[PDB]
Design a protein around this ligand. Sequence first.
Ligand SMILES: *[C@@H]1O[C@H](CO)[C@@H](O[C@@H]2O[C@H](CO)[C@@H](O)[C@H](O)[C@H]2NC(C)=O)[C@H](O)[C@H]1NC(C)=O
Lengths: 36, 49
Amino acid sequence: FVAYHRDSYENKTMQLMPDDYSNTHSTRYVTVKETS
Amino acid sequence: SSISTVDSMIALDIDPLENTDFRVLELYSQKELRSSNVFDLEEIMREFN
Ligand SMILES: *[C@@H]1O[C@H](CO)[C@@H](O[C@@H]2O[C@H](CO)[C@@H](O)[C@H](O)[C@H]2NC(C)=O)[C@H](O)[C@H]1NC(C)=O
């Protein structure tokens, strides 16, 4: 089983972005910032 | 004159009770009483939102 994000390729070192502020405590860092 | 006067007044001087302004003692502030809970409802509702 697998769920490729996009282009069906994999094993890519994607960085984490500071994202946008959501809650006064959470400091979330995301990557993205019949598909899957 | 030059004559001694008998001192026969038995002194009863009862100092009055001095006034006391009682403080409103605060043991735990509102911040401590709000932080004493593991589960804060407001934070949970903000996370759900
Ligand atoms: C992406 O690359 C990583 C790092 O090489 C792969 O991680 C390996 O995964 C296998 C399978 O579970 C483990 O046995 C290895 O120990 C992992 N590598 C390390 C260095 O610990 C990962 O499988 C790759 N993802 C893919 C190909 O989808």
